[PDB]
Paper text:
S-layer proteins (SLPs) are self-assembling, crystalline proteins coating the cell surfaces of many prokaryotes. We determined the atomic resolution structures of all functional domains (I-III from N- to C-termini) present in the three S-layer proteins SlpA_ac, SlpX_ac, and SlpA_amy. The Lactobacillus S-layers are anchored to the cell wall through interaction with teichoic acids (TA), either lipoteichoic acid (LTA) or wall teichoic acid (WTA).
The SlpA protein (~46 kDa) is the main structural component of Lactobacillus acidophilus ATCC 4356 S-layer, built of two domains. The N-terminal part, exhibiting the first two domains (SlpA_I and SlpA_II), is known to be responsible for the self-assembly of the S-layer protein into a regular lattice. One basic tile is composed of the homodimer of the full-length SlpA, dimerized at the SlpA_II domain. The assembly is propagated in one direction by alternating SlpA_I dimers and SlpA_II dimers and in the other by the pore spanning N terminus of SlpA_I. The self-assembly region (SA) is formed by domains SlpA_I and SlpA_II, building a 2D crystalline network that forms the exposed surface of the SlpA layer.
Author numbering:
A (entry chain A): 200 to 295, 299 to 312
B (entry chain B): 201 to 295, 299 to 318
The structure:
Amino acid sequence: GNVNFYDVTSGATVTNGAVSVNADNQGQVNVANVVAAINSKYFAAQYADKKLNTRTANTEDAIKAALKDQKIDVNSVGYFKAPHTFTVNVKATSNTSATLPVVVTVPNLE
Amino acid sequence: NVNFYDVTSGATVTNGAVSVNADNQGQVNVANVVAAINSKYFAAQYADKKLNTRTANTEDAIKAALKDQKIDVNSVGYFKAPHTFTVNVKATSNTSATLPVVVTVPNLEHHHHHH
Ligand SMILES: NC(=O)c1cccnc1
């Protein structure tokens, strides 16, 4: 009945997530690359009747909101100066909500 | 890669357990054990955000468990219930998994809070 988050590859339910994203040599990251990393690794679904019904997460919005809470601006094409780490609260809602806290690490900052 | 899952929650299960009541004569029917197990647990192969259900051999597993306990089942599926026994339910892969299920018959327990 509830939306849960799941590991894309195993299908196991998850409560906490983590991904790594490499910055470019100038320490910049694009939001679209964070979105792709998170959404490739984790998905949301409502389970019923031996079936998973996928639900869209607000990954992009969640990333920008996490960055703004760390006082990091993103430009109109999605670039920002990355911190070493930030936590994204990825949300998916039900039809009839779940939040996955995903720690993003940017490991290659000078 | 085949796993067993709880029918209602969808959570993966390693070891299952069910309770099945005997009749007044202390007999249980295989069909009631089948229904108890299969109503609660199912097998599936997970891939690509999708569950692909697989058939379990529940009835055969029950009869094999009962045979190994030297418990005879009659032609209409009735047997004299032992207190608790384990059934090894199997499902096969298309690309293969066993769920041990503990079956207990509660009307035949030696200890009980009731008076
Ligand atoms: N941990 C990760 O950065 C990650 C991202 C996507 C898939 N698998 C792992």
